[PDB]
Amino acid sequence: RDNIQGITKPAIRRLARRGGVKRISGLIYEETRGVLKVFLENVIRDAVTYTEHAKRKTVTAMDVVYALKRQGRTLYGFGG
């Protein structure tokens, strides 16, 4: 469908709050969706690359952990 809107305003505000943000421009929310999307495209492309190299039709968490390590964004706790 068209799911990027499903990253709602309030959910963006929540993340920003955890990030210590007090006041938030009206323009931030679309700007953040762009960044989040860019972030996902890159991580997933490498994940999928790993999946395809393994001749599988199902992305594993390792595919994603390995992709994340490739982006200098190591993740612990999903078999890493």
Partner: protein
């Protein structure tokens, strides 16, 4: 019960537990927390090993010895962490050699 054994999956968790009961005997550890401790041990294994692999390779040597591990450790860990980790690795080698 049900047939076919689930396929083996190595972990460090029994050793995390054992170290846990030395350091904090009245303290346990959650499922995901252990996944983290595993992901940690594996991270640092990889880092240390890789650097030792390189050290050995730069100085034209086929063999990774306790020497390489020490040097890698000095390169990788911060100050106090390296000292202690160097002490314990030395202790462990010293102790192992004399118990042959």
């Amino acid at each position: 019960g049900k047939k076919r054994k689930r396929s083996r999956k190595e972990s460090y968790s029994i050793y995390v537990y054992k170290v846990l009961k030395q350091v904090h005997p009245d303290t346990g550890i959650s499922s995901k927390a252990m996944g983290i401790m595993n992901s940690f041990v594996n991270d640092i294994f990889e880092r240390i090993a890789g650097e030792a692999s390189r050290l050995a390779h730069y100085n034209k040597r086929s063999t990774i010895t306790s020497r390489e591990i020490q040097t890698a450790v000095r390169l990788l860990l911060p100050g106090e962490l390296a000292k202690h980790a160097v002490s314990e690795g030395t202790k462990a080698v010293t102790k192992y050699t004399s118990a042959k």
